[PDB]
């Protein structure tokens, strides 16, 4: 029922939301056309986790994924986004998993 | 040097430029492990450019 086992080193059982089937499905078909996938969710731990879940639902290889953060809508921002990017942070992700 | 600051060029320049574009595109695609479909398509395009 919980979807997590406190007695087995916190192994969990995530599963797509009963109302996001379409959303997740469209990314899977669209993923082949895209060369390099850019996860641009919020920099906080919740956003970081959404990025982590996307990466594990779309599959592929780590190198095919990149993490970018958009400052503002201004071109002086959407540009710098792909300029000095990075990848997802595990510590941040695990912090959110701990809270959840 | 054409009049008005423009230029007249041989088609060879166009062919070489297309080949360079395809080659650099292929390498930048390859170095990040893209799905096989697009890499094969771009390899085919590169072969076409060479021909």
């Amino acid at each position: 029922r919980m979807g997590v086992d406190p007695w087995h080193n916190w192994e969990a059982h995530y599963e797509v939301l009963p109302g996001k089937e379409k959303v997740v499905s469209e990314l899977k078909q669209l993923a082949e056309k895209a060369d390099h996938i850019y996860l641009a969710t919020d920099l906080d731990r919740e956003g970081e986790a959404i990025a982590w879940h996307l990466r594990e639902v779309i599959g592929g290889d780590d190198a095919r994924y990149s993490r970018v953060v958009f400052n503002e809508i201004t071109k002086n921002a959407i540009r710098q986004a792909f300029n000095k990017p990075g990848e997802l942070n595990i510590d941040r992700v695990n912090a959110q998993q701990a809270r959840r | 040097p054409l009049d008005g600051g423009r230029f007249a060029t041989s088609d060879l320049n166009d062919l070489y430029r297309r080949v360079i574009n395809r080659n650099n595109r292929l390498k930048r695609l390859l170095d990040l492990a893209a799905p096989d479909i697009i890499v094969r398509n771009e390899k085919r395009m590169l072969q076409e450019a060479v021909d």
Binding site: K33, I37, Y38, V68 | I38
Partner: peptide, 18 residues
């Protein structure tokens, strides 16, 4: 090839794609 970008809010996406 084409790059795939993913954000949280749809409204923000439409704005980024622009």
């Amino acid at each position: 090839g084409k790059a795939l970008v993913i954000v949280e809010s749809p409204a923000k996406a439409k704005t980024i794609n622009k």
